[PDB]
């Protein structure tokens, strides 16, 4: 019950034509947004009962952006071959005006010439949906890779006879992979979702970009963090103190004491404790997997409150000596960030909400697990004092955090700032 099977190709062609006709970018963006919103509403209506759905905007997105097509091999039909096929199929005279116009196009693009030729020779209303067009193009590509032209001719004839002039023009442009609309890839991706361009850059497969980023509310952060999965924590960027006030638009920030401990993440779910490192290495054996095994896990099971059942945390692991009540540089753990609590995901929420909810995760208990000491500062003098205190305490440096910063795994920059003497 794919949505593409209920959407006529004529509607998409008309939307593209409207986008091209409009001069200002605002009208183009409005048309694309309206079409996408209608598609999303129809998708929501259709899939009310189904739980797992693979349907997405891919069927239309691939056509709108032919230059990103990788599932389909080269069609093998360039401008000259397409002109020859059009001349042969339409039974136009070899020496006629139409044939000369199609063949002699100064190898005013070929699509416009084909549209003008077919305007008085084709129907006014097509009946081919997006799914049928995609199937026909897939068949054409598969047959081209199999060295067979008769079925390619048959498919092209079917498309010609079951399409209008505008649809034929758009299909020719798609085959040539030269769909120009006045809006680049970046604008279309931004209109689609707020985190589509970078995801597509990360992975050169359009299907996942359209599938995972279907709900506009669900950002990249929610999908990048999953239960029982090892993600890539981000890191701060070294910056000079002299311009620290310029890094955050002179806004209030949080100062944290840097700890010389390995970055590591963990997930708690009932009597299950999963552990992972920054590089994805698994070390659940070191601290065990259940409260009845290991050294650190047994002492933290009671720390978590009853209100917390499923949670994900990330922090720094170091070593602690209770005898001198000291932290030894390169078992105690520090918590300074929460990625997910309960069903809801905290990735979208800014750092302020994460800090607010940290206090409600578990009661701090020195010796095994607690919350890393931190304060709020808004002046350079406070930063200097914190750095001096850290140096007096042998700490490597200072962490500067912007409350407005959001969780962006696998990225460098943002509010994560590292301050060290230099």
């Amino acid at each position: 019950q794919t949505v593409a099977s209920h959407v006529p190709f004529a509607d998409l062609c008309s939307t593209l034509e409207r986008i091209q006709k409009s001069k200002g970018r605002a009208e183009k963006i409005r048309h694309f947004r309206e079409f996408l919103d209608s598609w999303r509403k129809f998708h929501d209506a259709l899939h009310k009962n189904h739980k797992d759905v693979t349907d997405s905007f891919y069927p239309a997105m691939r056509l709108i952006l032919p230059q990103l097509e990788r599932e389909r091999m080269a069609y093998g039909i360039k401008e000259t071959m397409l002109a020859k096929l059009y001349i042969e199929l339409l039974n136009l005279p070899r020496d006629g005006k139409d044939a000369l116009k199609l063949l002699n196009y100064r190898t005013g693009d070929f699509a416009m010439i084909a549209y003008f030729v077919l305007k008085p020779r084709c129907l006014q209303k097509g009946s081919l949906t997006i799914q049928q067009v995609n199937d026909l193009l897939d068949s054409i590509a598969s047959n081209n890779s199999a060295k067979r032209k008769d079925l390619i001719k048959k498919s092209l004839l079917q498309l010609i006879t079951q399409s209008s002039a505008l649809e034929q023009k758009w299909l020719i442009r798609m085959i040539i992979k030269d769909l120009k609309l006045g809006v680049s890839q970046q604008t279309i991706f931004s209109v689609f979702h707020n985190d589509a361009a970078e995801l597509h850059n990360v992975t050169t497969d359009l299907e996942k970009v359209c599938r995972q980023l279907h709900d506009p509310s669900v950002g990249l952060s929610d999908i990048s963090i999953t239960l029982f999965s090892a993600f890539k924590p981000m890191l701060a960027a070294i910056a000079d103190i002299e311009h620290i006030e310029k890094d955050m638009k002179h806004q209030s920030f949080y100062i944290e004491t840097k700890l010389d401990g390995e970055r590591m993440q963990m997930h708690k779910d009932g009597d299950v404790y999963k552990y992972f490192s920054r590089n994805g290495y698994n070390y659940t054996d070191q601290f065990g997997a259940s409260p009845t095994e290991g050294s650190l896990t047994p002492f933290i099971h009671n720390a978590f409150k009853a209100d917390i059942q499923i949670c994900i945390l990330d922090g720094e692991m170091m070593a602690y000596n209770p005898n001198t009540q000291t932290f030894m540089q390169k078992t105690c753990y520090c918590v300074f960030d929460v990625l997910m609590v309960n069903n809801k995901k905290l990735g979208h929420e800014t750092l302020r909400k994460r800090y607010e909810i940290l206090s409600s995760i578990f009661t701090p208990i020195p010796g095994r697990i607690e919350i890393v000491q931190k304060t709020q500062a808004h002046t350079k003098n406070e930063v200097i004092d914190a750095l001096n205190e850290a140096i007096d305490k042998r700490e490597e440096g200072i962490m500067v955090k912007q409350p407005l910063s959001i969780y962006k795994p696998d990225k460098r920059g943002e509010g994560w700032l590292k301050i060290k003497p230099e």
Partner: peptide, 26 residues
């Protein structure tokens, strides 16, 4: 259920130019 049709819901400054004839009669 419905269908796809329902959801789709398809000042300034004046300028003057003089034009003088340059014929014998003038």
């Amino acid at each position: 259920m419905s269908g796809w049709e329902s959801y789709y819901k398809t000042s300034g400054r004046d300028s003057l130019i003089f034009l003088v004839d340059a014929s014998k009669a003038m």
